[PDB]
């Protein structure tokens, strides 16, 4: 995964909000990074646009089940991080937008 | 500096890693670019690898002093990015590896 286009490793929440808040990018642009906060968790930061809030980034924690799996909600779990990005690129299922472009 | 072989301008953090993470590059291949995230600072991106994570890129911010100079640590300051690049080619001096190859 150090070699996945969307995996930005251990960047901070500020760094990802800086990399993502760009009005030239389409909503649903995203990156997967490590959670600063929960040791062993990942985060899926996605930009969105709300008429009022304008451009905003949302952060979804991704927890690794003890067996190995990954989940954002109870509806679905993925056996890998790439299956999770793949699924949410086709179905938002709760996220603000389905994932479109990987962060530039 | 726009024509320096090692200077890669405004490329993104993500594009720098795409350039550096490649089998043809020695540990210590590098480039200098603008920091996307901190206007007015630069960034020295260096390829490295370990037998655990494989090839990975380390990013070191380069701050510009108001008096002209540049630094990555309090140990030494440099009057130009040319000076900084030459110093870290002879000495890692904090960095994961001394600078060996200008990124192709």
UniProtKB/Swiss-Prot annotation, chains A, B:
Source taxon at top rank: Eukaryota
Tissue: Expressed ubiquitously. Expressed in the skin (at protein level). Platelets, neurons and osteoclasts express 5-fold to 200-fold higher levels than most other tissues.
Subcellular location: Cell membrane; Mitochondrion inner membrane; Nucleus; Cytoplasm, Cytoskeleton
Cystine pairings recorded for this chain: none
Post-translational modification: The phosphorylated form is termed pp60c-src.
Disease entry from the Swiss-Prot or TrEMBL record: SRC kinase activity has been shown to be increased in several tumor tissues and tumor cell lines such as colon carcinoma cells. Thrombocytopenia 6: A form of thrombocytopenia, a hematologic disorder defined by a decrease in the number of platelets in circulating blood, resulting in the potential for increased bleeding and decreased ability for clotting. THC6 is an autosomal dominant form. Affected individuals may also have bone abnormalities and an increased risk for myelofibrosis.
Entry text on domains: The SH2 and SH3 domains are important for the intramolecular and intermolecular interactions that regulate catalytic activity, localization, and substrate recruitment.
Residues recorded with modification Phosphotyrosine: 42
Family label: Belongs to the protein kinase superfamily. Tyr protein kinase family. SRC subfamily.
Residue intervals of the SH2 domain: 6-103
Other facts: May be involved in blister formation in Pemphigus vulgaris, phosphorylated-SRC is abundant at blister sites but not in normally adherent tissue, which corresponds with loss and disruption of CDH1 in cells adjacent to blisters. Phosphorylated SRC is increasingly abundant at pre-lesional sites of blister formation and occurs prior to changes in abundance of CDH1 and DSG3.
Protein name: Proto-oncogene tyrosine-protein kinase Src
Oligomer and partners: Part of a complex comprised of PTPRA, BCAR1, BCAR3 (via SH2 domain) and SRC; the formation of the complex is dependent on integrin mediated-tyrosine phosphorylation of PTPRA. Interacts with DDEF1/ASAP1; via the SH3 domain. Interacts with CCPG1. Identified in a complex containing FGFR4, NCAM1, CDH2, PLCG1, FRS2, SRC, SHC1, GAP43 and CTTN. Interacts with ERBB2, STAT1 and PNN. Interacts with DDR1, DDR2 and DAB2. Interacts with CDCP1, TGFB1I1 and TOM1L2. Interacts with the cytoplasmic domain of MUC1, phosphorylates it and increases binding of MUC1 with beta-catenin.
Function: Non-receptor protein tyrosine kinase which is activated following engagement of many different classes of cellular receptors including immune response receptors, integrins and other adhesion receptors, receptor protein tyrosine kinases, G protein-coupled receptors as well as cytokine receptors. Participates in signaling pathways that control a diverse spectrum of biological activities including gene transcription, immune response, cell adhesion, cell cycle progression, apoptosis, migration, and transformation.
Lineage of producing organism: Eukaryota, Metazoa, Chordata, Craniata, Vertebrata
Organism this protein belongs to: Homo sapiens (Human)
């Amino acid at each position: 995964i150090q070699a996945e286009e969307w995996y930005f490793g251990k960047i901070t929440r500020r760094e990802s909000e800086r990399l993502l808040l760009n009005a030239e990018n389409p909503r649903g642009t995203f990156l997967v990074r490590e959670s600063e906060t929960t040791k062993g968790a990942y985060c899926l930061s996605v930009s969105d646009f709300d008429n009022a809030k304008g451009l905003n980034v949302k952060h979804y924690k991704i927890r690794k089940l003890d067996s190995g799996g990954f989940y954002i909600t109870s509806r679905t779990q993925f056996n890998s991080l790439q299956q999770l990005v793949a699924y949410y690129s086709k179905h938002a299922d709760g996220l603000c937008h389905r994932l479109t472009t990987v962060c530039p």
